Amino acid sequence: DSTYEMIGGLDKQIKEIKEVIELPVKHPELFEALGIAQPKGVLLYGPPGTGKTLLARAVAHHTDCTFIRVSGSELVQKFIGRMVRELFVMAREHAPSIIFMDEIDRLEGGSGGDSEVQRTMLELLNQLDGFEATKNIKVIMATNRIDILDSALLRPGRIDRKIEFPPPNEEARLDILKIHSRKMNLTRGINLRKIAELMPGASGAEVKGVCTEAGMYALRERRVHVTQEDFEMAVAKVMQKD
Amino acid sequence: RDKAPVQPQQSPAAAPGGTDEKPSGKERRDAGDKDKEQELSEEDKQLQDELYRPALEELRRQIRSSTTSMTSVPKPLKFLRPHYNKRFAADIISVLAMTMSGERECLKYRLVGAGEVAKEWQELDDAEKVQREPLLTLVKEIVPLLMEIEQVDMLEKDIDENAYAKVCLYLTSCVNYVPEPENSALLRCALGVFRKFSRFPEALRLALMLNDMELVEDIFTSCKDVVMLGRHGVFLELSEDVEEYEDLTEIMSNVQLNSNFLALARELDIMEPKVPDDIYKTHLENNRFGGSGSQVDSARMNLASSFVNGFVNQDKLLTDDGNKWLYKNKDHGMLSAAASLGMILLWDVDGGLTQIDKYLYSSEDYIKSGALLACGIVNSGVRNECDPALALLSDYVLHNSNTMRLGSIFGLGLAYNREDVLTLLLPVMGDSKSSMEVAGVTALACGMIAVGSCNGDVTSTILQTIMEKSETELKDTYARWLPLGLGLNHLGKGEAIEAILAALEVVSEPFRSFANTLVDVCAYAGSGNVLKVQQLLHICSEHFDSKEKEEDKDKKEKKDKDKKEAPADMGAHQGVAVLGIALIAMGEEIGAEMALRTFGHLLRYGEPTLRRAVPLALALISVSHDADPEVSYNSIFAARLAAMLRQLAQYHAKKGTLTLCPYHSDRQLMSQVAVAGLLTVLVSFL
Amino acid sequence: GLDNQIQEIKESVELPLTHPEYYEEMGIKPPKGVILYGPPGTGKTLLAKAVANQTSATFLRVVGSELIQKYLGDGPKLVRELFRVAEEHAPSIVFIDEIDGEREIQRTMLELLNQLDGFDSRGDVKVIMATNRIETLDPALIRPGRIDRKIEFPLPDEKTKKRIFQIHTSRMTLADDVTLDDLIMAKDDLSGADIKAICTEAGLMALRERRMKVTNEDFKKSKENVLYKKQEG
């Protein structure tokens, strides 16, 4: 589900995005007094914020809409489907929907089939740019990895939305790390404040790096509860690759 | 902020707690409150808990008006005796007095049918004359009870906003939504605000709707004292109906104070600017007389040439193309060609006299009868041709004065409560000659004479022709063209129960019941009568396939203004007669693409009734897309009826009763060719 | 400030298929069309000028010429398909927007040059060309397309943006301090989507305090984002 109880730290950005996404949801009457239309979407460029998808699944979970991705990372690639019209038919039947690519986030064949997917979403943006079947059809890009150059280059911020997202709120390092500590078995004498604030410079992926790279020492010592010293070692275990 | 300290302040019923808690709510009442007044559960005890009572009633109506209510809100206002551009007064007056006075004026409007709503509605009149919100205080003060001088109590400074806006949307909603008894208040109160103010032509429209002589007299002395003139003379005579131009010519025949109202406004001066300007600034090519004058044959394309020549009036070459053109055609072509020279000479009384005098006292019957018709068409205010025509009409069995009665009575009826010619037409109605066109041009003559009567009339003339109509139930064409003149006499009604009287005596076998439904066609000129729309949809499945044609044909006359509701799915059915009902119901307006879109599907049909009926309204509603549809007619066609009619539409392809009567009488063309003798002398054109 | 211009070109484009007495009897026959261009471009200015013909008619929209470089050099075959479908769909209006090895581009440009002129075709449909800048394209495309008359985008004459602002604000709620002369005079070379964009973000920014009425200070405060955004790059 990944509701608001599993994502936090972007209060200003959800306060700014409720007018981009939540506008056709609960207050569509401002079309006369304001004169707004359906934009292309929104994207967040920079380091991985450990929850780049939990936000889309969160707003989509509160909008009470379906989540249909394009690349089909989890058994949703051929379930719907020239494999280009079935997505628009399911988008016509299911008017509330949020599209977010996660799997896309050799240069000869990988850019060949990946160039076929890019041409697919380009002609889909041409069909949706020319005509429109129903509302509440918006696409969201993902620029968090290094191999993402087409989405960052083709979206400079001229006819789309752009958000500077290197330093989200420092809660992408602190409070979503606390949330990632709520799921796993957490003790009561831990202080995530210092170990969460003392990881500067490297990247924003310190949450997933310290959790996943700390699971090898919680798997080595076989401790029933995760201690702060495990995360302290995980800081070095993720700073060695820098 | 936090309501913890100030929340338990209203709970104690102590007088000091009220005299300091209520001023706090008045201070925080500028923006209403910080929330939606969720304290109802804690003030529902103060609801009944009453010296400084107007403040507690003010806060009570403030919270009850704040969260929700339907009747309990204005009671603290009517009991409060209100006392004591910012945001506070703009809110509590604008929106709180908007919804508040709206539900109070509505609940008192539908509740009782006291001066509380009067004095308070005048207080809102002043408050909204200070706030000055346009068309909103108006659009809400529409239905508030009084319908009196309050408008002149508001019409002091804002003249163009209230006139343009209020008269525009309140006139459109006063002819579409608001019924007639309040529209009379629009006519009298608009007579007040517009009589005391400027913009005379809209008051002249108030004379088009009132049909009174005091308005045109006051606007002729007020417009006479202030000195262009020819324009308001032109649409003055065009806008005035048959009643107020003879009442106008009798009060102006009394004084008129100027010699310019009789001399200028007597006759020939609505056409004296038209003819020379049309000859000077416009010039028609001779290819119309060349083509339409070159493909004439079969004695019917020549009839089309009698339509072109008959309604042409710059060029008069075909008129002066020698002789024998009248003799080559048929008898109806002898009437058409004999009346063409009279229809082209609506000017130069001496010239029309010296041109039609040749056909007078001729040897043929239709040359002299069409010559008297021409003498009736050339003018409409000379009335000196009455004696030579009427002097010989008394024959009663068979004589040339029967066709001379067709042309003389028809043209004399086009020239004009005239009692002498009607009492002379009484023996004509009693005659009942075999030719239907006698009672046709007689009933239509006196009918067009009597259009616009105040609440109709139940006089013994039309009562006499109703008795004679009930005498013998033969020759149903009498039961078709007599209700024409009857309904024309019933025209101008505002509250006449004459339709119900006809629903009492006239109701009989479906012939005179068809006359009754023709009275129903001339009984629903237009008001707020949605009961006739649901009753219309309920009666749309009648077995009688003619009362649907006429009663449903009335659609183009009833809703002639609101054209958004006129297009429907009538064509998708199988009742081609209804397809003709919409085909005629198109009209003569600017001709939007929806009408021509209906002419696209209605154009292609096999029966000559619909194929012959489609080009008339096709070219009447589009009068510059004229050549391509005619090429479509040439592609579909290539009998003689469609050829004569397609050349007719080739010619004429390029709210007064005078333009509404000829086609409504022309709705009976699906019969013998005898109607074609009267088809060429229609007055619906200019 | 372009009502006489839009009615002049409107009469220049409505004379075919409508009002035929002064189109074929007198012998006008301009079977070539016109060519348009806008300095701001964006397709919304030219779309707002040619949108007067889209009211009651059939319209065709082909934006950009990327479909030639993105694939192999198939040639003008797609233009031939648009030509045969324009012949089968004569009651329409042809409009092309965003008109932007080397030996093939020249031969398909000359073939498109002769094809656009229509040597073996009379007046059957109207073709209107549009691009960002007329100076970037070769001047050889002028004679086939523009043979009647061309028009350039005017300046902020304080009447066009005033009329468009009146249409967009025909039902909006604005305060009395919201003047118009500083807005229509301060702006320069802005399309309808720019004034509509600053009005949209102005109402959306005024909605942050549940204010149904937009003030002038919030309108200029919202305009600071567009004026600052256009100067950042």
UniProtKB/Swiss-Prot annotation, chain A:
UniProt-annotated stretches for the region May mediate interaction with PRPF9: 42-242
Function: Component of the 26S proteasome, a multiprotein complex involved in the ATP-dependent degradation of ubiquitinated proteins. This complex plays a key role in the maintenance of protein homeostasis by removing misfolded or damaged proteins, which could impair cellular functions, and by removing proteins whose functions are no longer required. Therefore, the proteasome participates in numerous cellular processes, including cell cycle progression, apoptosis, or DNA damage repair.
Residues noted as binding ATP in the record, renumbered to the chain: G46, P47, P48, G49, T50, G51, K52, T53
GO CC entries: blood microparticle; cytoplasm; cytoplasmic vesicle; cytosol; cytosolic proteasome complex; extracellular exosome; inclusion body; membrane
Compartment list: Cytoplasm; Nucleus
Keywords: Acetylation, ATP-binding, Cytoplasm, Nucleotide-binding, Nucleus, Phosphoprotein, Proteasome
GO molecular function: ATP binding; ATP hydrolysis activity; DNA-binding transcription factor binding; general transcription initiation factor binding; proteasome-activating activity; TBP-class protein binding; thyrotropin-releasing hormone receptor binding; transcription factor binding
Residues the record lists as N6-acetyllysine modifications: K78
Subunit relationships: Component of the 19S proteasome regulatory particle complex. The 26S proteasome consists of a 20S core particle (CP) and two 19S regulatory subunits (RP). The regulatory particle is made of a lid composed of 9 subunits, a base containing 6 ATPases including PSMC5 and few additional components. Component of a complex with USP49 and RUVBL1. Interacts with PRPF19. Interacts with TRIM5. Interacts with NDC80. Interacts with PAAF1. Interacts, in vitro, with the thyroid hormone receptor (in a thyroid hormone T3-dependent manner) and with retinoid X receptor (RXR). Interacts with ERCC6.
Main location: cytoplasm
Signal peptide: none
UniProtKB/Swiss-Prot annotation, chain B:
GO biological process: proteasome-mediated ubiquitin-dependent protein catabolic process; regulation of protein catabolic process
Modified residues (N6-acetyllysine): K475
Per-repeat ranges for PC: 336-369, 370-406, 407-438, 441-475, 484-513, 642-654
Keywords recorded for this protein, A-Z: Acetylation, Phosphoprotein, Proteasome, Repeat
Modified residues (Phosphothreonine): T19
Sequence ranges of Low complexity compositional bias: 5-16
Modified residues annotated as Phosphoserine in this record: S11, S24, S292, S294
UniProt xrefs under Gene3D superfamilies: Leucine-rich Repeat Variant
Tissue: Found in skeletal muscle, liver, heart, brain, kidney, pancreas, lung and placenta.
Nucleus in keyword set: no
Spans through the membrane: none
Signal sequence coordinates: none
InterPro entries assigned: 26S_Psome_Rpn1, ARM-like, ARM-type_fold, Proteasome/cyclosome_rpt, RPN1_C, RPN1_N
Domain of life: Eukaryota
KW Repeat (keyword) present: yes
Biased composition (Basic and acidic residues): 19-47, 547-567
GO cellular component: cytosol; extracellular exosome; extracellular region; ficolin-1-rich granule lumen; membrane; nucleoplasm; nucleus; proteasome accessory complex
Any one GO molecular function term: enzyme regulator activity
Region (Disordered) residue spans: 1-47, 547-569
Subunit structure: Component of the 19S proteasome regulatory particle complex. The 26S proteasome consists of a 20S core particle (CP) and two 19S regulatory subunits (RP). The regulatory particle is made of a lid composed of 9 subunits, a base containing 6 ATPases and few additional components including PSMD2. Interacts with RPGRIP1L. Interacts with CRY1 in a KDM8-dependent manner.
Similarity comment: Belongs to the proteasome subunit S2 family.
Official protein name in the record: 26S proteasome non-ATPase regulatory subunit 2
Species assigned in the record: Homo sapiens
From Swiss-Prot, chain C:
Modified sites of kind N6-acetyllysine: K70
Superkingdom as given in the UniProt entry: Eukaryota
Keyword Cytoplasm recorded: yes
Binding positions (ATP): G38, P39, P40, G41, T42, G43, K44, T45
Lipid bilayer topology: Lipid-anchor
Subcellular location: Cytoplasm; Nucleus; Membrane
One Gene Ontology molecular-function label: ATP binding
GO term, biological process aspect, one: proteasome-mediated ubiquitin-dependent protein catabolic process
Covalent link Glycyl lysine isopeptide (Lys-Gly) (interchain with G-Cter in ubiquitin), residues: K49
One annotated Gene Ontology cellular component of this protein: proteasome accessory complex
Keywords: Acetylation, ATP-binding, Cytoplasm, Deafness, Intellectual disability, Isopeptide bond, Lipoprotein, Membrane, Myristate, Nucleotide-binding, Nucleus, Phosphoprotein, Proteasome, Ubl conjugation
Family stated for the protein in its record: Belongs to the AAA ATPase family.
Disease: Birk-Aharoni syndrome: An autosomal recessive disorder characterized by failure to thrive, severe developmental delay, intellectual disability, spastic tetraplegia with central hypotonia, chorea, hearing loss, micropenis and undescended testes, as well as mild elevation of liver enzymes.
Function, in words: Component of the 26S proteasome, a multiprotein complex involved in the ATP-dependent degradation of ubiquitinated proteins. This complex plays a key role in the maintenance of protein homeostasis by removing misfolded or damaged proteins, which could impair cellular functions, and by removing proteins whose functions are no longer required. Therefore, the proteasome participates in numerous cellular processes, including cell cycle progression, apoptosis, or DNA damage repair.
Quaternary structure note: Component of the 19S proteasome regulatory particle complex. The 26S proteasome consists of a 20S core particle (CP) and two 19S regulatory subunits (RP). The regulatory particle is made of a lid composed of 9 subunits, a base containing 6 ATPases including PSMC1 and few additional components. Interacts with SCA7. Interacts with NGLY1. Interacts with PAAF1.
Name assigned to this protein: 26S proteasome regulatory subunit 4
Shown chain mapped onto the complete sequence: 189 to 433 of 440
